[PDB]
Design an enzyme around this catalytic site. Structure first.
Site, PDB file in Angstrom:
ATOM      1  N   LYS A  60       0.789  -1.299   0.009  1.00  0.00           N
ATOM      2  CA  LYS A  60       0.077  -0.112   0.007  1.00  0.00           C
ATOM      3  C   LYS A  60       1.071   1.113   0.001  1.00  0.00           C
ATOM      4  O   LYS A  60       0.726   2.083  -0.798  1.00  0.00           O
ATOM      5  CB  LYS A  60      -0.790  -0.103   1.076  1.00  0.00           C
ATOM      6  CG  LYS A  60      -1.756   1.277   1.402  1.00  0.00           C
ATOM      7  CD  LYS A  60      -2.483   1.063   2.731  1.00  0.00           C
ATOM      8  CE  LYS A  60      -3.508  -0.155   2.835  1.00  0.00           C
ATOM      9  NZ  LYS A  60      -4.057  -0.037   4.083  1.00  0.00           N
TER      10      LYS A  60
ATOM     11  N   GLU B 288      -2.258   6.598  14.019  1.00  0.00           N
ATOM     12  CA  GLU B 288      -0.901   6.136  13.101  1.00  0.00           C
ATOM     13  C   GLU B 288      -0.279   5.570  14.224  1.00  0.00           C
ATOM     14  O   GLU B 288       0.575   6.395  15.092  1.00  0.00           O
ATOM     15  CB  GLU B 288      -0.249   7.023  12.086  1.00  0.00           C
ATOM     16  CG  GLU B 288       0.930   6.594  11.254  1.00  0.00           C
ATOM     17  CD  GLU B 288       0.379   5.877  10.128  1.00  0.00           C
ATOM     18  OE1 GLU B 288       1.174   5.546   9.289  1.00  0.00           O
ATOM     19  OE2 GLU B 288      -1.000   5.534  10.283  1.00  0.00           O
ATOM     20  N   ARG B 289       0.458   4.222  14.411  1.00  0.00           N
ATOM     21  CA  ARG B 289       1.539   3.844  15.156  1.00  0.00           C
ATOM     22  C   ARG B 289       2.664   4.640  14.997  1.00  0.00           C
ATOM     23  O   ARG B 289       3.141   5.057  13.971  1.00  0.00           O
ATOM     24  CB  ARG B 289       1.658   2.243  14.946  1.00  0.00           C
ATOM     25  CG  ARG B 289       0.404   1.537  15.120  1.00  0.00           C
ATOM     26  CD  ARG B 289       0.464   0.132  14.663  1.00  0.00           C
ATOM     27  NE  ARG B 289      -0.439  -0.628  14.361  1.00  0.00           N
ATOM     28  CZ  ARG B 289      -1.479  -0.298  13.555  1.00  0.00           C
ATOM     29  NH1 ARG B 289      -1.164   0.412  12.452  1.00  0.00           N
ATOM     30  NH2 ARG B 289      -2.610  -1.085  13.183  1.00  0.00           N
TER      31      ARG B 289
END
Ligand code: ATP
Ligand code: MG
Lengths: 128, 493, 44, 468, 466
Positions: free
Chosen positions: E157, E183-184
Site C-alpha cells: 500500500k 498512526e502507530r
C-alpha cells in the site's frame, strides 16, 4: 415401566439422523426406529382426556413388551383408545389390581403380569 | 418580552432563557453581531418553564452564551411562490445558487397536518417517468406516494432525475430535495437539470452532509411546503396554471439519520436501531401531505418519490419498512441486476404499485398487461433456463421472449421516452414483431425505431398520442398505421 | 455424478454461509445497539 | 377551571390550575386558541400543586406559554347512537364529512369506560365464513371473537382487510365500525369510502350501516392514541342494545406506537425498545373493551404492523395474547408472489376445534399443517443437498407441501387494480373439499404452477385440462 | 479570556470564564503547563454561566483545578504554506520532526473551515489520471473525489501511495498531504519516514513533496479526531493556489473511532453499534472539503478498516456514502510478485461510466472484468479436473485472463532503486488501447511472460521481438 420408554425414545431421537437420510439401515435399526415411532405415537394424547395412572401403566406395559409391534403407526392412538375401552368394559378387575399394588417395589408381580398380558392378548384377537 | 438571551449552547441546541410569548415552533432569529454578518435561525421546541430549548438551524459554533435572540412571531416557515422556481435554496428558503435573492409573495408554514381523508380523491392522471419498465409494470399517477428503494449505487437518483426530466411538457413542478447528499452530487444533479433545461420548472432544496443536523431534518418539510403551495394555489408554467407537483425527497434514510442525531443530542430515549420512537411519525407526516385533492378542494396533486438506501439488499430494516408502509408503491432496484448490465434495474417480480394502475393511459396498460404476463413467465422459467436441449419449443420460445423484453427494458440514462414511443415499442415487441431480431441489438433497434417515427412518421406518433385516452386503444386506424410503420422499418433495416 | 452433486452442494453451502453471515452481522449490530441503549438508560 | 400553560413539550402540555380546581386524571381541557376553534387536550398525569400533564391531540405548534386552559370537567365525550351511523368522525367525535354536526339531543358517552366485567363475558363462538381459503381453513375467522393479522410493511394487510370487508360487509346482519388508527388516508380511507358507498344492500349502502372514526398517520400522537377508544365507545352502544357489530380496527400497532411517543414526551422511564412502561396496561384497557358480551356480540377483525419484520417486538407480542384467531403474514411468502402471504404454520385459531368447525375441517387443517411442517423440517436439506436425497414419501410430502403453498394463493376482488386476475370467493366447504382431495393424491400429476392464483380444486383441474 | 479550570475528569475538562468573553465552540483554549509547553483543549460545549466543556488533546495528568486557561478566540491554528512541505506535524500544528519551529511569519489558519460553497463545485466529474494501469482502468480515480483502499498493509500500500505522490509531483503541480490518523509511532511513523526519504524522483525525495500530519495512537481521542481536519487545513492552502493535491488518510475508521470515543466521553447518548450520534455530521465535516472546485482539486485516498467484516456497519457505511472509488488490495495477488496487487473484481469506481471515461474505456474495462470473472469461476474447475476438461475459447479465456492479470503489473519509479527497473507511467488512453489490443487477439502468441512488470502493449511486443 417408563425406564425402557425413556431409553427407547432417546435412542430413536439419536437414530433420527440415519432415519432422515439413510435407507440402507439394517433390520435391527429399522425395527428400532419403528419402536421409537410406536412410542412417539403412543404419546399423541388428545385434549381434555386425561388417563389415570393404571391406564397409562397398562398402555406403557403393552407397548414396551412388544405387544404393540404388529400395529401400524397411524392406528396406534386408536388402538390405545380401543384398548382402554376394553379394560373399561371387559376387565375392570385388571385395572383395579394394577392400581391397588402400584406402590410395590417390584411392580411386575406374577399376579399382575398375568391377567394383563392375558387381557392384552385377548384384545389382540378381538380387534384385527 | 420578545427578546431573550442564550444561556447555554450545546449539542446543536441553545437554551434561550427569557423568551416569553414564543409559540411552540417559532423561528427565532439570533440577530447578527460582531463577527457574524448573516443571521442564523432556530426552531424553539421545548417551551419549558423559564427556558426555551431551540434547535440551531446552522453551525452551532457561531453563537455564544449571552447572545441576543429575537422572536420572529412566525411558526417555522419557508418562502414559497413562483419565485422559487429554478432556484437552488436552503431548507430555510435562502438561495445558494448565487443567482440572486428569492422574490416571494408569501411564506408557507412547514410542519402542518395533511389535508385529511375526505379531502382526497383516487388518482386518475398518470405520471410519465420515461422509463419503459416503470411506466409499463409500475404505473405512477399524480398525487400518489411511490418509493424508490435500492442498495447504495443502484440508480435511485438516476431514476428520480429521469422522472424529473421527462415532466417537461406535462405541466409538472418538479421538486428535488437533497437530504444529506454530498455537495458534489447535488452540484452534478443541478448541472444535469440545467443542461436539459428542466430547471425552468424545478425547485431544488439542498441540505448537504456537511450542514447541521438541524437541516436535513426540515429540508423535506420545506420541499413539501413548496409542493403543497403548488398543489393548492398553483403557479404559472408555460403560460398555464399548474397545480400538480412532483417531489423527490431523495435519501430519507439520511433524513432519518439526521433526525436520530437531533433526538439523541436532545437526550431523547432511543428506540429500535437507536432511532427515536417517532421516526415513523416523522416520515408519515412528511409523506401524508402528498395527496390527490378532490374537485371541491382544488383538484391539485403532489406526487412524492422518496428514496431509501438499504444495506446488502435488506428491505426488512426499520426505516425501509417504515417508508414502505407509508408509501403506496415500491420500486426495488436490485444491485445484482444493476451489475449485470440491466441499468434500469427493477425487481419487477416483487416491485409493485398498489395505486396508480388505474391512473394509467389505457393504451399503456393495454400493451403492458400481457408484457407483465410474459415477464412473469420468464421469471418462472428462469429455473428451467439452466437445462440445454431438454426444453420443448414453448419453454424455449418463452425464454427467448423474456430475454428480448428484458433487453428492451434496458434503457440508457438521460434518455426519457414519450408515452407514444413507449406504447408503440411495447406493441411491436409484445405482438411478436421482434422475434426475428437478435437480442444484443434490440436496444439499439429501439433507438433506430424511435428515430424512424421521429422522421418518417410523425403523424403516427401524433395519432398514437391523441388516441391514448380511448377505452380501446388498438382501434383499426391506429393498429393498421402502426403495423405498417413497423413493417416498413423492418424492411428498410 | 457424485462429484457434480458435491460441487452443487458445496456451492449451496457457501451461499447459505453468506446468508447466515449477513444475518449474524445484523444480529450482532442489534445486540450491540440494545446493550448500549440499556446501559445508557441505566446510567441516565 | 381557567388554568395557564406552563410548558409545551411536543404534544404534551403542562398546565397549572387553581389548588382546589385541579382536573381529574382523564378530564379534557381546552385551549381557546383563538379564531373560534379550540384545542382539546386530555389530562394524563397530576404532578403536584395544580400542575397537570395532558396530551394535545392536535397541532400544538402555534401556541405559547401562559395561554389559558379551560377545564371541561368531563373526559372526551363522543356521540353514540343511530345518529353516528353512516358518518365519519375524529378522535373527538366531531364529524369530518360534509354533512352537518351531530345534534345536542344525541347522547354523549365518555371514551374512557370500564371494560365488560367477568360476568358479562360471552365465550360462545362459531365459524365466520370469509371466502379466503387460507383464513377459512388454517385460522378460521371467528364470529363474536377477536382475530388479527400480523404483517410486515410489504405484505398485503390492507388488501386482506379490504377483501374481508367486501366479502362480509354486505351480509352484516348488523351495524359495523371501522377505526383508521395510524393508516394511509389514500387507501386506508377515502377509497374504503368509495368501496363502501358503492356496495348496496337492498337499496341501503354498506356505508349507511358503518360508523367510521379515523385519526390516521398525519394526526399527532394523541389522536392516534385515542381514536381506537373513540371507535370502541361508538361500537359499545350498538353492542349494548343487542345489534351485532363488525369491528375493523387498522394497525393496533400504530395505536401502541403513539402511546410510545406520548410516553416519551411525558418523561416516563422507557422500557424495552423505547416503548412505554405502561404498554401491557394500555393494550389491556383498549382490547378488553373489544369483547362480545351476553347483551350483544362484536365480531372484531384487527390489523397489527410488525416493526421491520420482528415478531418479537413488544407491540405484536402484547397483541398475541388478546386474540381468538391469529393470522401471520410473512414477507418471504409475499416475495414469492403469494399475495395472501399467510403463513399456515404461524397462524392459529381457537375455534379450529372438531366440535366447532367440523371433524372433516379439523382433520384437513391438521393434515395441511403436518404437511408444510415436514416441509419446514426439510428446508435446509433441500437447500444444500437437493431434492434427490429425500426418501420417496418425503419427496411426495415436499411436492404436496409446495403445491399447497401455491394453492393457498387466491386472487381478490379488490386486487384488480394491480393484478389482472379476477377475484374468487371460495366457500369454506369448497376449500375443505379441495384440500382433502389434494391431500388424498388427486392432483399429484398436475404441475405446481397450475395451483397459483386459483379458487377451489375444480378451477385447477379445469386449468389443467385447458393446458391439456 | 483568562479563565480557570473548574473540573478535570479524564481528558474532558471544564473551564469557567467571565460572564463575557466566553469561548465559542471549537475555540482551542490553552492551559500553560508551568513552562514553555502548553496543553491545547478544544471547546466542545458551552454550559451555564461561563463554563465550557472541552477535550484535553493531551496528558491532562499534571493539571489542577483552578489553573489558568487562555482563550485563543479561534479554532486550532494550523500553519499553512510551503514551509509545511517536507515537515511532519501533529494535530496542533507543532512540528514533531527534528527540525525547529515553523516561525511566526508563516500564516496560520483555523482548523475548522467550511466546505466550498455550492457555486464553486464542479458541474462535471473529471477523471484523475494516476498513471497506474490497473488503477486507471478497473477503478479509475475521480479528480476531487474520495477513494478507498482495502489492504492489510503487507501488500505494498505504501508503494502505491508513494507512486501516486511521485506521479502527481512530476506530471502535475504535485503536492500531497498524508494524514496518519491513529498512526502507530513505530510502524506508521518511522518506517514511512525512511520509505519517503529514501524514495526519490527526479532528484527530489518523496518526503520533500509531501506534508505529513500524524495523530498518533498515544494521543487522546480529540487529537485523533482533529488530525484529519488539520491535514485538510494544510492541504487547502495548496488547493487555493490552483494546485491539485492528493490527501492520503490512513484508516479513516480510526477517525470514526476517535469521534465515537469523544462523544462517549462528552456523555452524548450512544447510537446503533457504539457509534456517535453525530456520525453522519462528523463524516460530512470531513470529506466534504475534499472536492474539486473551480480553483483547484483535492483528491483523497483513504484506507478503510472494516469492523469485523461488515460493509453494513455504520462506520464503513458512512465512509462508503462519501466514496467515489474503492481499491481492494488482496493478499494472494501480492504473494505472486504482482506488486500493484489491486483485485480487479472487488475494486470498483463510480466514474467508470461511458458518459465520463468514454465508451471505449467502459467497453474494455467490462470485458477485462468479464474474462477475469470467468477465470474466477473456472478456478474451481481447473483444480477439479485439470485444464483439459475446459472447453476451447474457455481455455483461451483462462489463458488470456492469466496474461492480463500478469499485465496488471507495472514498474514504479519509486521502486526503481529496489528492483532496478525504470518506472513506466501509462496514460489512461494508452492503457485502454493496450488492453483492448490485448483482448482483441494481439499478443496471444506471446506467452504469459513478457507481460510481467511492463508498460503499454508496445513494451510487451518490443520485448517479444528482442
Ligand atoms: N440507466 C442507467 N444507465 C447507465 N448508467 C446509469 C444508469 N442509471 C444510473 N447509472 C449510473 O450509475 C451510477 C449510480 O447512479 P446514481 O447516481 O443514480 O446513484 P444511486 O444509486 O441513486 O445512489 P448514490 O447517490 O448513493 O450514488 C452513476 O454513475 C450513474 O451514471
Ligand atoms: Mg443516488
Amino acid at each position: 415401566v417408563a425406564g425402557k420408554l425413556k431409553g427407547e425414545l432417546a435412542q430413536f431421537r439419536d437414530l433420527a439422523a440415519f432415519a432422515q437420510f439413510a435407507s440402507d439401515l439394517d433390520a435391527t435399526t429399522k425395527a428400532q426406529i419403528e419402536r421409537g415411532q410406536r412410542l412417539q405415537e403412543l404419546l399423541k394424547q388428545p385434549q381434555y382426556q386425561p388417563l389415570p395412572v393404571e391406564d397409562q401403566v397398562a398402555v406403557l406395559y403393552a407397548a414396551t413388551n412388544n405387544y404393540l409391534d404388529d400395529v401400524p403407526v397411524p392406528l396406534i392412538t386408536k388402538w390405545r383408545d380401543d384398548f382402554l375401552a376394553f379394560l373399561r368394559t371387559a376387565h375392570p378387575e385388571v385395572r383395579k389390581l394394577i392400581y391397588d399394588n402400584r406402590l410395590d417395589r417390584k411392580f411386575p408381580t406374577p399376579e399382575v403380569k398375568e391377567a394383563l398380558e392375558a387381557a392384552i392378548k385377548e384384545f389382540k384377537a378381538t380387534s384385527n | 418580552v420578545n427578546v431573550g438571551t442564550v444561556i447555554a449552547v450545546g449539542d446543536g441546541v441553545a437554551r434561550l432563557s427569557g423568551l416569553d410569548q414564543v409559540v411552540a415552533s417559532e423561528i427565532v432569529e439570533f440577530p447578527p453581531k460582531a463577527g457574524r454578518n448573516e443571521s442564523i435561525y432556530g426552531i424553539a421546541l421545548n417551551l419549558e418553564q423559564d427556558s426555551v430549548a431551540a434547535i440551531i438551524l446552522g453551525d452551532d459554533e457561531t453563537i455564544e452564551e449571552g447572545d441576543m435572540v429575537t422572536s420572529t412571531g412566525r411558526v417555522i416557515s419557508v418562502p414559497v411562490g413562483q419565485g422559487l422556481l429554478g432556484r437552488v435554496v436552503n431548507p430555510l428558503g435562502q438561495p445558494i445558487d448565487g443567482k440572486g435573492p428569492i422574490v416571494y409573495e408569501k411564506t408557507r408554514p412547514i410542519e402542518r397536518i395533511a389535508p385529511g381523508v375526505i379531502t382526497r380523491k383516487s388518482v386518475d392522471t398518470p405520471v410519465q417517468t420515461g422509463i419503459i419498465a416503470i411506466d409499463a409494470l409500475i404505473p405512477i399517477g399524480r398525487g400518489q406516494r411511490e418509493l424508490i428503494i435500492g442498495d447504495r449505487q443502484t440508480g435511485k437518483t438516476a431514476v428520480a432525475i429521469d422522472t424529473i426530466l421527462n415532466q417537461k411538457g406535462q405541466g409538472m413542478v418538479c421538486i428535488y430535495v437533497a437530504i444529506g447528499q454530498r455537495r458534489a452530487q447535488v452540484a452534478q444533479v443541478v448541472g444535469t437539470l440545467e443542461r436539459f433545461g428542466a430547471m425552468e420548472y424545478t425547485i431544488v432544496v439542498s441540505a448537504t452532509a456537511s450542514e447541521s443536523a438541524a437541516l436535513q431534518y426540515i429540508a423535506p418539510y420545506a420541499g413539501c411546503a413548496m409542493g403543497e403551495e403548488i398543489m393548492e394555489n398553483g403557479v404559472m408554467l408555460n403560460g398555464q396554471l399548474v397545480k400538480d407537483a412532483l417531489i423527490v425527497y431523495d435519501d430519507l434514510s439520511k433524513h432519518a439519520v439526521a433526525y436520530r442525531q437531533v433526538s439523541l443530542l436532545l437526550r431523547r430515549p432511543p428506540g429500535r436501531e437507536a432511532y427515536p420512537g417517532d421516526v415513523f411519525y416523522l416520515h408519515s407526516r412528511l409523506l401524508e401531505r402528498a395527496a390527490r385533492l378532490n374537485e371541491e378542494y382544488g383538484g391539485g396533486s403532489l406526487t412524492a418519490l422518496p428514496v431509501i438506501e438499504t444495506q446488502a439488499n435488506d428491505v426488512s430494516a426499520y426505516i425501509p419498512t417504515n417508508v414502505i408502509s407509508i408509501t403506496d408503491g415500491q420500486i426495488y432496484l436490485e444491485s445484482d441486476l444493476f451489475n449485470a448490465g440491466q441499468r434500469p434495474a427493477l425487481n419487477v417480480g416483487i416491485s409493485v404499485s398498489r395505486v396508480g394502475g388505474a391512473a394509467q393511459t389505457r393504451a399503456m396498460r393495454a400493451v403492458a398487461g400481457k408484457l407483465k404476463g410474459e415477464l412473469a413467465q420468464f421469471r418462472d422459467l428462469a429455473a428451467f433456463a439452466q437445462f440445454a436441449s431438454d426444453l420443448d419449443a414453448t419453454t424455449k420460445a418463452q425464454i427467448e421472449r423474456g430475454q428480448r423484453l428484458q433487453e428492451l427494458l434496458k434503457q440508457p440514462q438521460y434518455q426519457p421516452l414519450p408515452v407514444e414511443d413507449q406504447v408503440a415499442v411495447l406493441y411491436a415487441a409484445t405482438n411478436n414483431y421482434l422475434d426475428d431480431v437478435p437480442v444484443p441489438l434490440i436496444t439499439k433497434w429501439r433507438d433506430d425505431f424511435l428515430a424512424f417515427l421521429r422522421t418518417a412518421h410523425p403523424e403516427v406518433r401524433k395519432l398514437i398520442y391523441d388516441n391514448r385516452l380511448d377505452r380501446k386503444f388498438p382501434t383499426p386506424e391506429v393498429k393498421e398505421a402502426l403495423e405498417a410503420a413497423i413493417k416498413e422499418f423492418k424492411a428498410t433495416s | 455424478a457424485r462429484m457434480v452433486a458435491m460441487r452443487n452442494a458445496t456451492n449451496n453451502a457457501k451461499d447459505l454461509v453468506r446468508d447466515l453471515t449477513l444475518s449474524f452481522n445484523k444480529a450482532r449490530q442489534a445486540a450491540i445497539t440494545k446493550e448500549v441503549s440499556e446501559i445508557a438508560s441505566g446510567a441516565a | 377551571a381557567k388554568g395557564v400553560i406552563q410548558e409545551i413539550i411536543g404534544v404534551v402540555i403542562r398546565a397549572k390550575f387553581p389548588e382546589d380546581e385541579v382536573p381529574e386524571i382523564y378530564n379534557a381541557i381546552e385551549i381557546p386558541l383563538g379564531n373560534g376553534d379550540r384545542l382539546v387536550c386530555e389530562v394524563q398525569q397530576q404532578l403536584g400543586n395544580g400542575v397537570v400533564k395532558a396530551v394535545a391531540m392536535g397541532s400544538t405548534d402555534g401556541l405559547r406559554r401562559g395561554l389559558e386552559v379551560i377545564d371541561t370537567g368531563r373526559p372526551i365525550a363522543v356521540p353514540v347512537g343511530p345518529a353516528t351511523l353512516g358518518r365519519v368522525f375524529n378522535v373527538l367525535g366531531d364529524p369530518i364529512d360534509g354533512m352537518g354536526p351531530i345534534g345536542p339531543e344525541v347522547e354523549r358517552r365518555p371514551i374512557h369506560r370500564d371494560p365488560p366485567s367477568f360476568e358479562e363475558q360471552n365465550t360462545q363462538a362459531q365459524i365466520f365464513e370469509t371466502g379466503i381459503k387460507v383464513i377459512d381453513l388454517i385460522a378460521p375467522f371467528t364470529r363474536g371473537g377477536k382475530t388479527a393479522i400480523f404483517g410486515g410493511a410489504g405484505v398485503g394487510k390492507t388488501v386482506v382487510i379490504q377483501e374481508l370487508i367486501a366479502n362480509i360487509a354486505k351480509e352484516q346482519s348488523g351495524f359495523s365500525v371501522f377505526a383508521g388508527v395510524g393508516e394511509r388516508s389514500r387507501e386506508g380511507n377515502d377509497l374504503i369510502h368509495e368501496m363502501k358507498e358503492a356496495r348496496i344492500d337492498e337499496n341501503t349502502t354498506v356505508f349507511d350501516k358503518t360508523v367510521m372514526v379515523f385519526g390516521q398517520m398525519n394526526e399527532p400522537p394523541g389522536a392516534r392514541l385515542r381514536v381506537g377508544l373513540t371507535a370502541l365507545t361508538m361500537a359499545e352502544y350498538f353492542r349494548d342494545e343487542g345489534r351485532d357489530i363488525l369491528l375493523f380496527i387498522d394497525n393496533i400497532f400504530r395505536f401502541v406506537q403513539a402511546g410510545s411517543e406520548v410516553s416519551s414526551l411525558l418523561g416516563r422511564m422507557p422500557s424495552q425498545v423505547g416503548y412505554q412502561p405502561t404498554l401491557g396496561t394500555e393494550m389491556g384497557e383498549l382490547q378488553e373493551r373489544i369483547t362480545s358480551t351476553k347483551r350483544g356480540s362484536i365480531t372484531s377483525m384487527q390489523a397489527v404492523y410488525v416493526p421491520a419484520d420482528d415478531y418479537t417486538d413488544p407491540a405484536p407480542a402484547t397483541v398475541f395474547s388478546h386474540l381468538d384467531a391469529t393470522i401471520s403474514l410473512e414477507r418471504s411468502i409475499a416475495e414469492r408472489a403469494i399475495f395472501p402471504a399467510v403463513d399456515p404454520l404461524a397462524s392459529t385459531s381457537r375455534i379450529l376445534d372438531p366440535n366447532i368447525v367440523g371433524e372433516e375441517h379439523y382433520r384437513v387443517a391438521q393434515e395441511v399443517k403436518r404437511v408444510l411442517q415436514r416441509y419446514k423440517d426439510l428446508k435446509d436439506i433441500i437447500a444444500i443437498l437437493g431434492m434427490e436425497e429425500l426418501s420417496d414419501e418425503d419427496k411426495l410430502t415436499v411436492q404436496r407441501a409446495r403445491k399447497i403453498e401455491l394453492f393457498f394463493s387466491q386472487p381478490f376482488t379488490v386486487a384488480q387494480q394491480f393484478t389482472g386476475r379476477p377475484g374468487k370467493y371460495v366457500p369454506v366447504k369448497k376449500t375443505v373439499e379441495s384440500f382433502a382431495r389434494l391431500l388424498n393424491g388427486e392432483g399429484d400429476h398436475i404441475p405446481e404452477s397450475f395451483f397459483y392464483m386459483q379458487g377451489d380444486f375444480d378451477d385447477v383441474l379445469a386449468a389443467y385440462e385447458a393446458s391439456q
